[PDB]
Amino acid sequence: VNSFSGYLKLTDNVYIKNADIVEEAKKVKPTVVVNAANVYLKHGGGVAGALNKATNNAMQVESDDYIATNGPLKVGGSCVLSGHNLAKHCLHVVGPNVNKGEDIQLLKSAYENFNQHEVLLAPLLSAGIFGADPIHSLRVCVDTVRTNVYLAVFDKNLYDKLVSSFL
Numbered sequence: 001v002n003s004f005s006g007y008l009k010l011t012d013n014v015y016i017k018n019a020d021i022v023e024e025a026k027k028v029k030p031t032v033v034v035n036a037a038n039v040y041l042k043h044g045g046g047v048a049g050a051l052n053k054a055t056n057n058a059m060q061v062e063s064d065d066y067i068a069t070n071g072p073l074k075v076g077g078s079c080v081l082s083g084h085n086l087a088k089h090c091l092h093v094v095g096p097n098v099n100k101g102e103d104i105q106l107l108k109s110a111y112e113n114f115n116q117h118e119v120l121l122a123p124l125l126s127a128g129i130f131g132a133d134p135i136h137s138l139r140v141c142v143d144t145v146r147t148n149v150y151l152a153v154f155d156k157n158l159y160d161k162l163v164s165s166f167l
């Protein structure tokens with residue numbers, strides 16, 4: 001049993017809810033929240049901007065030190081950093097950004113990072129301002145992630161379309 005409430009069960013391991021990923025983390029304090037990161041960990045907008053704002057910019061300060069030491073992530077890659085006031089840990093995952101011309105085949109590699117964690121609160125990778133089709137992102141998630149993933153879909157309209165089109 002875990003603390004996640006109000007989710008629709010899609011598969012053995014994938015759950016979905018209409019929720020802003022920022023308010024859900026604050027309520028649940030999950031072990032792992034996933035950030036929709038870029039390779040520079042520049043948390044300007046989208047999910048990353050919202051998560052970072054909720055940490056009062058502490059996520060960005062920690063991230064800048066991580067990049068100064070390690071250099072940029074890979075598209076499809078990840079790093080584990082603090083969850084600050086939102087979670088124990090934040091798994092910063094880089095899905096391909098279609099609005100930068102990145103290979104959508106890298107979305108499966110991105111979701112493979114989730115398998116290193118038994119339970120996660122996450123957004124749909126490469127959705128929103130990353131430009132991918134969220135229906136596709138959900139299909140890759142279901143077909144790639146084997147650990148227990150709780151997806152927060154911000155758009156009520158999109159949430160309803162994802163559920164009603166799910167195979």
Ligand SMILES: NC(=O)c1ccc(O)cc1
Binds near residue numbers: 022047
């Ligand atoms: N909380 C927000 O402002 C936000 C922004 C983009 C998303 O994809 C999800 C949430």
